[PDB]
Amino acid sequence: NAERKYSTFYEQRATLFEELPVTSKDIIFLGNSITNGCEWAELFQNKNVKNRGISGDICMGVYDRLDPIVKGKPAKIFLLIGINDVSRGTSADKIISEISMIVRKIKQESPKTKLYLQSVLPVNDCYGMFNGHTSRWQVVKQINDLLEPLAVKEGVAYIDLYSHFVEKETGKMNPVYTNDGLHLLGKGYLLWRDIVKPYVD
C-alpha cells in the first residue's frame, strides 16, 4: 500500500515534469521529499529556480528521470538524494556508486551545467517516526565522507549542509529544524537558504 503510493506519486510528478520546459537559465533543485517540500523560487526570490523534488525518491528514481531536466541544459543543478536508499538498507558504497552514475549522466548530456552535490542531511530518532530512516542515522556520515571526494574526483562542487543541521554531540539532526526527525520545518529551509544562496547567486 505504501510502495504503491510512492510509485503512483512518482509517476504523477515525473509526468508533470515532462510537460514543463527547462531552459538554459534554469536552476534546478533535484531530490526527494526534502527537495519536494520547498517553494524554491520564493525562498531565493528568483524566478529561474525550479522544483524537481519527488517525495520518496531514490538514486535510480532520479537517474531514470534526468532526461526532461538535462535536455534543457539548465544553468545549475543542486542534487540532494540518498536517504530513502538508506532506509532500504542500501550500503553507503552502493549509494555513492549510484550518485556517481547521476553525476556522469548529467556531465555527458549537459556538460555546461554546474552540478552541486549536497551532503545527505542528518536524521533523528527522537520523534519516533520514520524508523527505517532514523535508526540508520550513522549511515549519513558514511555517505558524506565518500560524497565529498566523489565531488572533487568528478570536478563538481560539494555543499556541506550536514554540519549546520547536525548536533555535533549526537550525530543527529538538531530538533529545531524538524518535527519528525527527517523532513524540514520552515526554519530548516531558511537555514538551507542561507547556506546555498551564495551558490544560487
Which residues are documented as binding site? 127, 175, 178
Q: Where does this chain touch its own copies (CB under 8 A) — which range of 74-82, 91-99, 157-165, 184-192?
A: 184-192
145 binds its own copies (CB under 8 A): no
Stretch that binds its own copies, among 16-24, 57-65, 82-90, 161-169 (CB under 8 A): 16-24
- Binding span for Mg ion by CB under 5 A among 57-65, 118-126, 142-150, 174-182: 174-182
Q: Which is nearer to its own copies, 12 or 138 (CB)?
A: 12
As measured in angstroms, the least distance from the Cβ of 149 to its own copies is: 32
What does 19 bind: Cl ion, Mg ion, its own copies, none (CB cut-off 5 to 8 Å by kind)? its own copies
Select 91 or 179, whichever has its Cβ closest to its own copies.
179
**From the CB of 182, what's the least distance to Cl ion, in Å?**
8
Helix H, strand E, coil C: the string for the chain is: CHHHHHHHHHHHHHHHHHCCCCCCCCEEEEECHHHHCCCHHHHHCCCCEEEEECCCCCHHHHHHCCHHHHCCCCCEEEEECCHHHHCCCCCHHHHHHHHHHHHHHHHHHCCCCEEEEECCCCCCCCCCCCHHHHCCCHHHHHHHHHHHHHHHHHCCEEECCHHHHECCCCCCECHHHCCCCCCCCHHHHHHHHHHHHHHHC
CA dihedral 130, 135, 136, 141 (to 10 degrees): 100
As measured in angstroms, the least distance from the Cβ of 9 to Cl ion is 11
Size of the site for Mg ion (CB under 5 A): 2
Asked if 64 touches its own copies (CB under 8 A), the answer is no
For Cl ion, the closer CB: 1 or 108: 1
175 or 186, CB closer to Mg ion? 175
The nearer residue to its own copies, 71 or 104, going by C-beta atoms, is 71
39 binds, among Cl ion, its own copies, Mg ion, none (CB under 5 to 8 A by kind): its own copies
In what order do the strands lie in the sheet containing 76-80? Answer: 49-53, 27-31, 76-80, 114-118, 157-159
